[PDB]
C-alpha cells in the first residue's frame with residue numbers, strides 16, 4: 014500500500030478515523046489499520062498464525078511413535094484435541110485421572126500404557142473420622158532408612174586469553 | 176523471529192555469528208522449567224487429599240472464614256477471594272517473538288492442596304506429617320500446644336470461652352485490614368512490575384537505528400542493492416544481540432532470588448504448619 | 452541402590468551442564484564472525500597489514516564476547532553450587548552431630564540419627580527414622596474429677612478400653628492405672644467441658 | 650583484637666574488592682580501543698566528521 | 700512555517716464566558732498544508748467593510764493522552780514545574 | 781518428527797519427555813498492490829531539456845509532485861557520462877513511492893564534478909553548493925560541448 | 930493588555946490514529962500558563978509561529 018509492505022490478513026475494521034488520518038498504530042510502531050488509496054475505506058491488519066512445535070515421546074527404547082503439540086495455535090487451519098496450551102495431534106482423550114509422567118500444561122498431561130492425554134489427579138482421596146470424643150493411638154512401630162544426595166563442588170577450570 | 180523479522184537473507188547472515196542462539200533458548204527453557212519445580216516443592220507436601228467432615232464441633236472456634244466455599248466458581252474461601260481481588264484464552268506469539276506459557280498447576284489444584292493441608296491440620300494435629308493422620312479433638316490439640324511453650328494445660332480448660340472469643344475476633348479483624356489497606360501486598364507486586372518493565376524495554380528497543388539508515392528491515396531490503404545492503408544489515412544484528420543478552424542475564428540474576436524465596440517458603444510450610 | 456538406577460540425577464546433571472558449557476565454548480572458535488576465514492594463520496599468511504588488522508579486530512571482538520558470556524554463566528553456576536554446599540554443611544552440623552527436632556529437615560518422621568557417605572562430587576546422607584503403625588482408636592476425656600477435685604494428667608492422655616480408664620503416652624500404647632503420682636489436681640469440675648466421673 | 654592482625658578478614662576483603670572494581674573501571678578511560686587517540690577533544694580537533 | 704511548508708490548523712467552538720479565553724481543553728485539527736518554501740518574518744491582519752490575541756510558539760516536549768475514540772483529552776507540559 | 785528430535789538432541793536414542801524442535805508459520809500467497817488513480821505524465825524531460833542552465837552560486841531549484849515518475853526510460857539512456865547514485869539504488873527506483881522530488885540543476889567545470897558528494901570539503905563544495913551529511917537522491921552529470929563552449 | 934493562556938494551543942502533531950495510549954512528543958507548542966497580548970493595523974513579528982485567537 015503506497016510503499017507500505019506487509020504480511021498478514023485483512024479484515025473490515027470498526028474503529029473510526031477522522032477525515033485527515035491515513036493509518037493507525039496500536040502501540041509504539043504497530044501498523045494495524047490502513048486506508049486504501051482508491052476506494053477510501055479502512056481495513057485492519059493482523060498477522061496469520063505461527064508458533065512453536067513440541068514432540069511428546071514415550072522413549073525410543075520402549076515404542077516408536079510420538080505426538081505433536083502446536084503451541085498457542087487454534088488448529089482449525091493447520092485425533093485432534095484442543096487444549097489450553099495449543100493443541101495435541103496423535104493422542105486420545107479419556108475421562109480417567111492418573112498420575113502422569115509427561116506434563117503438557119494447564120492441568121493436562123499425557124502418558125503411554127497408546128499415548129493418552131488426560132487430567133492429572135492430585136492423589137488418593139479419603140476422609141478422616143473426626144469426633145469430639147475419640148482419639149487414635151499407635152500400637153506398633155517401624156524403623157525406616159532414607160537416603161538423600163547433596164552436591165558440594167564442581168571441577169576447577171582455568172582458561173587463558175592469549 | 177526477534178532479530179530477523181520473517182526474512183531469509185538475514186538468517187543467512189546470522190548463521191555466520193556462530194551459535195549465539197542455542198544458549199539463550201536453553202537458558203530461557205531452564206528458567207521456565209525451574210519455575211514449575213518452585214511451585215511443586217512448596218504446596219505438594221501432602222500425599223492424600225483429606226476433607227473436613229460436616230460436623231463443626233471444634234469447641235467454639237469458628238473456621239468458616241478460611242474453609243472452602245462450595246457455592247463458588249473456584250471453590251475458594253473468603254480470604255483467598257479478598258487476596259485475588261486486591262491484585263491486578265489461547266494467547267498467541269506476537270511478531271516480536273514474545274510468548275507466554277500457562278502454568279502446569281492451575282489455581283484450582285493449588286486451592287485443593289491448601290484445603291487438604293488445612294483440613295489435615297485441623298483434624299489431626301501434627302501427626303499427619305510423620306505417618307497416617309490420627310484424629311484428636313481440637314480442644315485437646317490446643318491444650319497440647321499450650322503445654323509445649325511452658326504453660327500448663329489446665330489454663331485452657333478453665334479459659335476456653337475467652338480464648339475462643341479472642342481467636343474469633345482476631346480472625347474477623349483481618350478482613351478489614353485486607354480489604355481496606357491494599358498496599359499490604361507489596362511483595363507480590365514488585366516482581367510483576369520489574370518483569371513488565373524489563374520486557375517493555377526489550378520490546379521498545381526494536382525501533383532504534385543503531386547507526387544504520389533505518390530501524391525496520393523491510394525498508395532496507397527494499398531500497399539498497401544486495402551487494403551493498405550487507406553493511407547496513409549489520410550494525411543492526413549487533414545491537415539486538417546485546418539487548419537480548421542483557422535481558423537474559425538480568426532474567427537469570429533475578430530468578431535466583433525467586434528460587435531462594437521459594438526455598439524459604441517451603442521451609443516455613445514444612446516446619447511451621449505441619450509441626451510447632 | 453545397586454539395582455535401581457537414576458538415583459544420582461543431580462550430580463550427573465551438574466557434570467553434564469559443565470561439559471556442555473565447555474564444549475560450546477570450544478566449538479565457538481570456528482566461526483567467521485564476518486571475516487574472510489576462521490583461522491588467523493591463513494589471514495596473516497595471505498594478506499598485508501592494512502586490512503589484515505580489520506579482520507583480526509573482527510575475530511578478536513567476536514571471541515572476546517564469547518569468552519565473557521562463558522565467564523558470566525560460570526559465575527552464576529558457582530553461586531548456585533555455593534548455596535547448595537552451605538545447605539549441606541548445615542545439615543551435616545545439625546543432623547549428624549546431634550538430634551534434630553525441626554520437622555521436614557532430616558527424613559520423613561521422627562528423626563533418630565544419621566550416617567554420612569562420600570560421593571564423586573557430593574555427599575550422601577542416610578537418615579534413620581521412627582514411624583508408627585497398626586493404629587487403634589479409643590474413647591478419651593480431658594480430665595477426671597474425684598471428690599469434686601479435677602485431676603489432669605502430668606504427661607500422657609486418658610483413654611478407655613470400654614469399661615476402665617487408663618493413662619497412656621501419646622506415641623505408644625502402654626496403659627497404666629490412674630494414681631495420684633501421675634495426675635495433678637486443679638480446681639473443681641464445674642467449668643471444664645468433658646469431665647467424666649471416675 | 651588489639652594485637653593479632655588479619656582478624657577482620659571479611660570486611661577488609663569486601664572493601665578491597667569494591668575499591669579495586671572502581672579503580673579498574675576508572676582506569677579504562679585511557680584505552681585506545683582501536684581508535685586513533687584515547688582523548689576525544691583532540692581527535693575531534695584534528696579530523697573531519699566523516 | 701517549517702522546512703518549506705506552510706501549515707494552518709483551526710478550530711471553532713462557542714463559549715459562555717464573555718471576558719477572556721475560557722478554562723478547558725480542545726485539540727486543533729489541521730486544515731491546510733502548502734508546499735511554498737518562503738521566508739516569513741512579519742504578518743498583518745485585514746478588515747471587513749479589532750480584537751484578537753497573539754501568542755508565540757516555542758519548542759517544547761508535551762505528553763498527550765488519547766481517549767478511546769482517538770481524540771486528545773488532556774496534555775502535560777514537561778518543563779513547567 | 782522423531783527424526784527432528786534425534787537431530788535436535790544429536791543422538792540416536794531419546795528418553796521419555798517433551799522436546800521442542802522448531803516453529804511453523806503460514807506461507808502467504810496472492811500478493812496485492814494498491815496505488816492511486818493519478819496517471820499524468822511528468823515533466824522530468826524538460827529538466828534535462830532546459831536550453832539554458834544557471835551558474836553554480838545560483839542553481840535552478842525545481843519541485844516535483846503529483847506525477848508518475850519513470851526512471852527506467854531515464855536509466856537506459858546512454859547520453860550521460862556518470863550516474864553515481866548514493867542513497868537507495870540505480871534500478872530499484874520504480875518500486876518506491878516518495879512524497880516530493882527536488883531537482884537542482886546547474887553547470888560545473890570538469891575538475892569539480894567529483895566534489896559533488898556528501899561528507900567532503902573542497903573549493904566549490906564548501907563555498908558554493910554543499911550537500912548535506914545524509915542521502916539526497918543522487919547526482920547526474922553529462923558533458924555538453926556544443927552550447928556553452 | 931495581557932491575559933493568561935491557561936491550556937490553549939494544542940494541535941494534532943501527526944496524521945496517525947491512536948487510541949487509549951499516552952504519547953510523548955516534542956514539537957513547537959505554545960507554553961502552558963503564559964501571556965497572550967491583546968490587540969486592537971500594526972505589523973507584528975513572526976518568530977516561529979503565531980497562535981491567533983479571536984472573538
Ligand SMILES: *[C@@H]1O[C@H](CO)[C@@H](O[C@@H]2O[C@H](CO)[C@@H](O[C@@H]3O[C@H](CO)[C@@H](O)[C@H](O)[C@@H]3O)[C@H](O)[C@H]2NC(C)=O)[C@H](O)[C@H]1NC(C)=O
Nearest residue numbers: 700702703704735736737738739740741742841974975976
Ligand atoms: C528571509 O528574510 C530574512 C530577513 O530577516 C533573511 O534573514 C536575514 O535577516 C537579517 C536580519 O535578521 C538581515 O539583516 C542582516 O543581518 C545580519 C546579521 O545581523 C547583518 O550582519 C547584516 O549586515 C544585515 O543587517 C539579512 O539581510 C537577512 N538576509 C538576507 C539574505 O536578506 C532571510 O535570509 C530571508 N530568507 C531567504 C531564503 O532569503
Ligand SMILES: *[C@@H]1O[C@H](CO)[C@@H](O[C@@H]2O[C@H](CO)[C@@H](O)[C@H](O)[C@H]2NC(C)=O)[C@H](O)[C@H]1NC(C)=O
Nearest residue numbers: 085086087088089090095096097264265266267
Ligand atoms: C477456535 O476455532 C473455532 C473454529 O473456528 C472457534 O469456534 C468458532 O468461534 C466463533 C467466534 O466466537 C464462533 O462465531 C463460531 O460459532 C465458533 N464455531 C464453533 C464450531 O465453535 C473458536 O472460537 C476458536 N477459539 C479460539 C480461542 O480462537
Ligand SMILES: *[C@@H]1O[C@H](CO)[C@@H](O[C@@H]2O[C@H](CO)[C@@H](O)[C@H](O)[C@H]2NC(C)=O)[C@H](O)[C@H]1NC(C)=O
Nearest residue numbers: 139140141142143147149308310585586587588
Ligand atoms: C476408628 O473409628 C472409626 C469408626 O468407624 C473407623 O475409622 C473410620 O471408619 C469409617 C467407617 O464408616 C470410615 O468411613 C472412615 O473413613 C474411617 N476413618 C478413617 C479411615 O480415618 C475405624 O473403625 C477405627 N479405626 C481402626 C483402626 O479401627
Ligand SMILES: *[C@@H]1O[C@H](CO)[C@@H](O[C@@H]2O[C@H](CO)[C@@H](O)[C@H](O)[C@H]2NC(C)=O)[C@H](O)[C@H]1NC(C)=O
Nearest residue numbers: 143144145146147230232233234312590644645
Ligand atoms: C460432642 O459434644 C457434645 C456436646 O458437648 C456431647 O454431647 C452431645 O450433645 C448433643 C447435642 O449437642 C446430643 O445430641 C448428644 O446426645 C450428646 N451426647 C451424649 C453422649 O449425650 C457429645 O457427647 C460429644 N461427643 C460426641 C461423640 O458427640
Ligand SMILES: *[C@@H]1O[C@H](CO)[C@@H](O[C@@H]2O[C@H](CO)[C@@H](O)[C@H](O)[C@H]2NC(C)=O)[C@H](O)[C@H]1NC(C)=O
Nearest residue numbers: 151152153154155156582583584585586587624
Ligand atoms: C510389629 O511389627 C513387627 C514387624 O512387622 C512384628 O514382628 C513380626 O511379627 C510376625 C508375626 O508375629 C513375624 O512373623 C515376624 O517374623 C516378625 N518380625 C520380626 C522382625 O521379628 C511384630 O509382631 C509387630 N507387633 C505387634 C504387636 O503386632
Ligand SMILES: *[C@@H]1O[C@H](CO)[C@@H](O[C@@H]2O[C@H](CO)[C@@H](O)[C@H](O)[C@H]2NC(C)=O)[C@H](O)[C@H]1NC(C)=O
Nearest residue numbers: 231232235236237238239240241253343346347
Ligand atoms: C462464624 O462466622 C461467620 C461469619 O461471621 C458466621 O456467619 C454469620 O451467621 C449469622 C447467623 O446466621 C449471620 O447473621 C451473619 O450474616 C453471618 N456472617 C456472614 C459474614 O454472612 C457464623 O455464624 C460463625 N459461626 C458460628 C457457629 O456462629
Ligand SMILES: *[C@@H]1O[C@H](CO)[C@@H](O[C@@H]2O[C@H](CO)[C@@H](O)[C@H](O)[C@H]2NC(C)=O)[C@H](O)[C@H]1NC(C)=O
Nearest residue numbers: 333334335336337338339340341342343344345
Ligand atoms: C484478661 O483479659 C481479658 C481480655 O483481654 C478480659 O476479658 C474481658 O473482661 C471484660 C470485663 O468483664 C469484658 O468486658 C470483656 O468482654 C472481656 N473480653 C473478652 C475477650 O472476653 C479479662 O477480664 C482479663 N482478666 C483479668 C483477670 O483481668
Ligand SMILES: *[C@@H]1O[C@H](CO)[C@@H](O[C@@H]2O[C@H](CO)[C@@H](O)[C@H](O)[C@H]2NC(C)=O)[C@H](O)[C@H]1NC(C)=O
Nearest residue numbers: 589610611612613614615616617626627628629
Ligand atoms: C478393659 O480392661 C479391663 C482391665 O484389664 C478388662 O478387665 C479385665 O478383663 C480380664 C479378662 O480376661 C479379667 O481377667 C480381669 O480380671 C479384668 N480386670 C478387672 C479389673 O475387672 C476388660 O476386660 C477390658 N475390656 C475390653 C473390652 O477390652
Ligand SMILES: *[C@@H]1O[C@H](CO)[C@@H](O[C@@H]2O[C@H](CO)[C@@H](O)[C@H](O)[C@H]2NC(C)=O)[C@H](O)[C@H]1NC(C)=O
Nearest residue numbers: 595596597598599600640641645646647648649
Ligand atoms: C458425677 O457425680 C456427681 C455426684 O457424685 C453427679 O452430680 C449429682 O448428680 C445427681 C444426679 O443427676 C444430682 O441429683 C445431684 O444434684 C448432682 N450433684 C451433687 C452434688 O450430688 C454428676 O451428675 C455426675 N456426673 C455425671 C456425668 O454423671
Ligand SMILES: *[C@@H]1O[C@H](CO)[C@@H](O[C@@H]2O[C@H](CO)[C@@H](O)[C@H](O)[C@H]2NC(C)=O)[C@H](O)[C@H]1NC(C)=O
Nearest residue numbers: 027028029030765766767768769770771772948
Ligand atoms: C466515543 O464513541 C462511542 C461510540 O459511538 C460513543 O458512544 C455513543 O455515544 C452516543 C451519545 O451518548 C450514544 O447515543 C451511542 O449509543 C453510543 N454508542 C454506543 C455503541 O453505545 C461515545 O459517546 C464517544 N465518546 C466518548 C467520550 O466515549
Ligand SMILES: *[C@@H]1O[C@H](CO)[C@@H](O[C@@H]2O[C@H](CO)[C@@H](O)[C@H](O)[C@H]2NC(C)=O)[C@H](O)[C@H]1NC(C)=O
Nearest residue numbers: 824825826827828829830854856857858859922
Ligand atoms: C528531451 O526530451 C526528448 C523527448 O523525450 C528526449 O529525446 C529522446 O532521446 C532518446 C535517447 O536519446 C531517443 O531514443 C528518443 O527517440 C528521443 N525522443 C525525442 C522525441 O527526441 C531527450 O533525451 C531529452 N533531452 C535530454 C537531454 O535527455
Ligand SMILES: *[C@@H]1O[C@H](CO)[C@@H](O)[C@H](O)[C@H]1NC(C)=O
Nearest residue numbers: 050051052053815816817818
Ligand atoms: C479511482 O478510480 C476508480 C476507478 O477508476 C474509482 O472507482 C475511484 O472512485 C477513484 N478514486 C477516487 C478517490 O475517486
Ligand SMILES: *[C@@H]1O[C@H](CO)[C@@H](O)[C@H](O)[C@H]1NC(C)=O
Nearest residue numbers: 071072073074075076795796
Ligand atoms: C528398554 O527396552 C528393554 C527391552 O524391551 C527393556 O528390557 C528395558 O526395561 C527398557 N528400558 C527402559 C528404561 O524402559
Ligand SMILES: *[C@@H]1O[C@H](CO)[C@@H](O)[C@H](O)[C@H]1NC(C)=O
Nearest residue numbers: 105106107108109110131132
Ligand atoms: C466420558 O466417557 C463417556 C463414555 O465412556 C463419554 O461419552 C464422555 O464424553 C466422556 N467424558 C467427556 C468429558 O468427554
Ligand SMILES: *[C@@H]1O[C@H](CO)[C@@H](O)[C@H](O)[C@H]1NC(C)=O
Nearest residue numbers: 931932933934962963964965
Ligand atoms: C505577563 O506579563 C506581565 C507584565 O509584562 C508579568 O507581570 C506577568 O508575570 C506575565 N505573565 C507570566 C505568566 O509570566
